[PDB]
Every structure is written in structure tokens, then in C-alpha cells.
Amino acid sequence: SGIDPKRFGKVAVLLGGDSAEREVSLNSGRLVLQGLRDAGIDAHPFDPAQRPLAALKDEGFVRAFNALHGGYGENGQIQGALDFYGIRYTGSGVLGSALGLDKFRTKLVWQQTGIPTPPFETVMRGDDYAARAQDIVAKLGVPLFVKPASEGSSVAVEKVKSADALPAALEEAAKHDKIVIVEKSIEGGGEYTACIAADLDLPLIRIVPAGEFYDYHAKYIANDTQYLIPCGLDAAKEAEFKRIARRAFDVLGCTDWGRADFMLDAAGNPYFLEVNTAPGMTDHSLPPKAARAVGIGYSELVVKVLSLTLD
Numbered sequence: 027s028g029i030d031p032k033r034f035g036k037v038a039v040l041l042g043g044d045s046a047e048r049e050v051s052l053n054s055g056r057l058v059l060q061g062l063r064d065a066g067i068d069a070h071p072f073d074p075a076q077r078p079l080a081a082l083k084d085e086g087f088v089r090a091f092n093a094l095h096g097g098y099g100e101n102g103q104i105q106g107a108l109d110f111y112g113i114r115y116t117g118s119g120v121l122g123s124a125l126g127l128d129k130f131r132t133k134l135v136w137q138q139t140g141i142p143t144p145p146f147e148t149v150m151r152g153d154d155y156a157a158r159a160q161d162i163v164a165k166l167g168v169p170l171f172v173k174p175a176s177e178g179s180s181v182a183v184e185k186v187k188s189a190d191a192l193p194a195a196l197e198e199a200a201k202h203d204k205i206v207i208v209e210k211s212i213e214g215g216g217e218y219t220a221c222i223a224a225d226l227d228l229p230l231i232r233i234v235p236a237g238e239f240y241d242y243h244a245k246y247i248a249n250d251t252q253y254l255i256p257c258g259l260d261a262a263k264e265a266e267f268k269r270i271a272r273r274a275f276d277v278l279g280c281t282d283w284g285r286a287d288f289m290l291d292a293a294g295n296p297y298f299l300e301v302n303t304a305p306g307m308t309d310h311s312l313p314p315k316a317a318r319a320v321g322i323g324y325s326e327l328v329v330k331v332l333s334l335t336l337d
């Protein structure tokens with residue numbers, strides 16, 4: 027393989043959209059289109075915000091590389107519509123896509139299938155926030171991470187360092203998601219991500235934020251968040267975590283395009299935070315880095331991802 031690019035037929039690269047991440051998507055999608063055309067594949071841009079989606083079927087596209095991020099592009103909406111119209115697509119199906127955006131149900135699944143994840147409690151809108159805060163501190167201690175359960179709240183993740191500050195953080199979070207996750211903070215180790223692309227053996231990435239945690243500032247503002255390969259871990263642990271990461275993805279119904287995000291504690295135990303079924307494909311994005319670390323260039327990576335829509 028050695029795939030005749032003819033075998034891919036007429037291919038759409040879905041890019042743009044209407045979400046808050048239209049920008050990263052335009053960037054990723056134009057690169058992906060080039061990567062596929064560099065391989066001689068009959069690929070075309072298709073922006074579903076600006077083109078009628080039925081044209082995919084009507085113009086005879088057979089498959090799509092999904093370079094959308096956020097809203098309908100990532101949550102199962104456009105995956106369902108594509109299944110409905112008979113168009114094959116990269117990444118996960120409806121269930122994996124929707125379950126991967128729902129941290130509450132992701133973490134339940136993981137707990138029942140032995141995928142490690144930070145101990146947690148939930149808080150619902152209309153709860154007695156002061157009373158829940160007491161019970162939660164008593165169980166989990168401080169610090170804690172307070173996060174929306176579900177897609178796509180407007181209240182950023184908050185690290186709560188003191189018991190007295192918990193009730194306000196709960197009440198605010200619950201104003202914007204009916205379900206709030208409250209996680210034990212995993213301290214004393216480091217942060218990592220496992221990119222998954224087919225059966226490619228991709229290295230782990232250590233993520234080193236310059237401040238408290240991988241916050242909006244660290245991801246989108248800061249010039250100095252580190253994304254490190256080698257990740258620092260010993261070979262047996264790195265292999266072990268990559269294996270767990272792939273099971274974490276599989277048990278949610280996700281198929282093998284994405285990244286699995288995890289923390290390590292001081293003892294070196296892992297705790298998975300989320301999967302991401304729509305990772306970036308810009309020139310500074312993590313899957314191309316991890317792939318180039320093992321000798322797989324950008325066009326080769328996009329062809330490998332697309333190849334799984336065959337058969």
C-alpha cells in the first residue's frame with residue numbers, strides 16, 4: 027500500500043463550517059486538500075456552511091476527509107448526515123463522535139471498562155451547591171477541576187484550590203451546563219497525549235504548559251507551551267500508555283483517528299481526561315508532528331487516514 031489513488035474516487039475535504047473553530051478548520055482543510063492532491067487523489071474543498079450538503083451525493087463524491095472542528099463537525103451531526111447521504115468519512119461515527127464530546131458519559135464508560143480516569147463527582151443545576159461542595163471535598167480533597175460534562179458550555183475549566191471556593195465554582199458552572207464534572211486534580215507528574223492514526227506507531231507527546239495547567243492561554247495565546255517528543259517516559263511505560271490509549275478510544279466507539287489525553291500522577295499512574303475525535307491538521311498541529319517523528323510525512327499521514335474509509 028501502495029494504494030492506487032484512483033481507488034479513492036472523488037473526495038471532498040470538509041472545511042470551514044459555522045463553528046467558533048472555523049479558522050483552524052480552514053487552515054487544516056487547505057493543508058489536507060494539498061496533502062491529498064500531492065498524492066494524486068481527486069480531492070476538492072467542500073465547505074458545508076456555503077454549499078448545500080446534498081451536493082456531496084448529487085455531485086458524486088464517494089468519501090470525505092473531515093477537517094471540521096467544533097459544533098456539527100465534531101459532535102455526530104454531520105457524521106449522521108453523511109451516513110444518511112451514503113458518503114464515507116474519516117474519523118468516528120455518530121456514537122463515537124457524540125460520546126467523545128460528553129465527558130460525563132465517557133468517564134462512566136471508562137470506569138466500567140477499567141480505563142483509568144480521575145475520580146469524580148457530579149453536580150446538577152438546582153443542587154445545594156454548598157452542601158455538594160462539602161461532600162465532594164470530603165471525598166476527593168483539593169485541588170479539584172470543575173468542568174462541563176457535556177458539549178458545548180461557555181464556562182472554561184476551573185482549578186479550585188480551596189474548599190471555600192468550591193460552591194461559587196459549582197454554581198457558575200451549573201449556570202451553563204445542566205451537568206458539572208468535579209475531578210480530583212492529578213498532581214505530581216506530567217501531561218501527555220497519544221495520537222492515533224490507523225495502526226501507525228506514533229509516539230506520545232508530553233505537553234508542558236508554562237502556567238498552572240493546559241488552559242486557553244497555554245493552548246492559544248502563550249508562545250512557550252512545549253510539545254515534547256521524546257515524551258521522557260521509559261520505553262515500557264510509553265508502550266503501555268499507548269495501548270491503554272487505544273483501548274480508551276475503542277471502548278467509546280471511536281475509530282482510530284484522534285488523540286487520547288491523559289495525566290500522570292507522582293507515582294506514574296495514568297488518568298485519561300478525554301478523547302479528541304477531530305484533531306488539528308495545521309502545520310503546527312500534533313498529529314503531523316507525531317507522524318514526522320516516525321518518518322511519516324504530512325501527505326502520507328492524510329492518505330493513511332483516508333485509506334481507512336476504503337473497504
Ligand SMILES: Nc1ncnc2c1ncn2[C@@H]1O[C@H](COP(=O)(O)O)[C@@H](O)[C@H]1O
Binds near residue numbers: 209217239241
Ligand atoms: N483532573 C485533572 N487533573 C489535572 N489536570 C487537569 C484535570 N482536568 C483537566 N486538567 C487540566 O486542564 C486541562 C483542560 O481540561 P480539559 O479540557 O477537561 O481536559 C487539561 O488539559 C489539563 O491541563
Ligand SMILES: [Mg+2]
Binds near residue numbers: 095
Ligand atoms: Mg475542540
